[PDB]
Write a protein that binds this ligand. Sequence first.
Ligand SMILES: Nc1ncnc2c1ncn2[C@@H]1O[C@H](COP(=O)(O)OP(=O)(O)O)[C@@H](O)[C@H]1O
Ligand code: BEF
Ligand SMILES: [Mn+2]
Length: 437
Amino acid sequence: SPPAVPQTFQVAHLHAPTGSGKSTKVPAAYAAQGYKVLVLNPSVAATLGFGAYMSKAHGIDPNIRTGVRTITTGAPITYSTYGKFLADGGCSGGAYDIIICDECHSTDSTTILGIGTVLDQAETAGARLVVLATATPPGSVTVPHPNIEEVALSSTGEIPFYGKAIPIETIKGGRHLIFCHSKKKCDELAAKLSGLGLNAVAYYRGLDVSVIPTSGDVIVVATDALMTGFTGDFDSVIDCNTCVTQTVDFSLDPTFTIETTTVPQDAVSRSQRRGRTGRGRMGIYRFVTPGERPSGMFDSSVLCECYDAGCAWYELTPAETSVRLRAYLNTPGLPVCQDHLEFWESVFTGLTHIDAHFLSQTKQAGDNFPYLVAYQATVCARAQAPPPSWDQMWKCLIRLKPTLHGPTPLLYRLGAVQNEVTTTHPITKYIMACMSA
DNA sequence: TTTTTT
Ligand SMILES: Nc1ncnc2c1ncn2[C@@H]1O[C@H](COP(=O)(O)OP(=O)(O)O)[C@@H](O)[C@H]1O
Ligand code: BEF
Ligand SMILES: [Mn+2]
């Protein structure tokens, strides 16, 4: 099944169910043939996990690259997160024969930028093959999994869960993964469970992967941070079936609005989340709501997210980001989106001389669109004006509060606006212009 | 994801 290594560069797809071996068996096979393989995965947890597993199951200690830990062994297989790959500077000259863009169903901006980088540098780097692997391609619909029995939750149970309940005997003893749409819910549920005498831990972006025990009874409560790649050896997965997403609204008031909303999971999410169990053995998947929305396309806001990440984390200029996103959108078989590259590139191109201290603060705070948030703050500081509001999002300006006055020079909307507003700032006029033509 | 001196 795995694509054969051609004589000249070629991009191929690899589609197989969750747990089939795409991220482990396949690269092992390629390595056995004498090829140097690089596997890019969006999950730090899974990446670190591949190192241990491959070591004691495939008799191979691969190189590991993540922002948390690096392991260089010199093996013919390297596992790296897209993030670390971008941070390292992309493809290295003549380093690998095959590059596997693993879990290519992921629509987070880091994965998009990472895959686009590969599609644009691979051939020049000397790679002869690029593989786009996923158990859930664009137009895919959730299909029955041989190892996973799906059981709906009911109103019976001593643990409230998104309108339904979870019976304690369903998670008492054994290993279980519970998906919650938000970090706050994860903390609350874990606490609720711990209080009942169960071994429960929360996990989401920001916490150490070590919080999840390798063995022994445990109930992990997580966000989509454990949706893909990861094998936690769970006997079951309980899914709230909801997720948090973002949408861009060109509301011209004065420019655009990026609204975050909680909605039902799409087909990719349902299959990937379900697939965290039933990996190399039988498992159970319990759900709150059946069905799901179609997959295959993402919002223009994700493109905005890519430019933002490029500027804030990967030292990529807007033009550089465009080159990479074009490669991604010009390759068939991947998630599609409106072609708003010109628009978004022009938007970020005008955002110069951001206050580094603010950028640093929004990145560490883990805010969405840290560059846009920090840039709005930068403009407020320079105009000696207050932020749109005084919610956590704008705390980086508290130190200047006593000096801030007048209306806020609104560049765009990222949340609720309480203070008066002015739309005459050069940047606001520029963005409005970008939206015109 | 990516990410801390003297
Ligand atoms: N970290 C791990 N710990 C234990 N088993 C693992 C681990 N990773 C993979 N496996 C085993 O190998 C199989 C294939 O895993 P993997 O390659 O990640 O699947 P996928 O096809 O979803 O990419 C799993 O079903 C499981 O039995
Ligand atoms: F499809 Be597997 F869960 F990476
Ligand atoms: Mn995988």
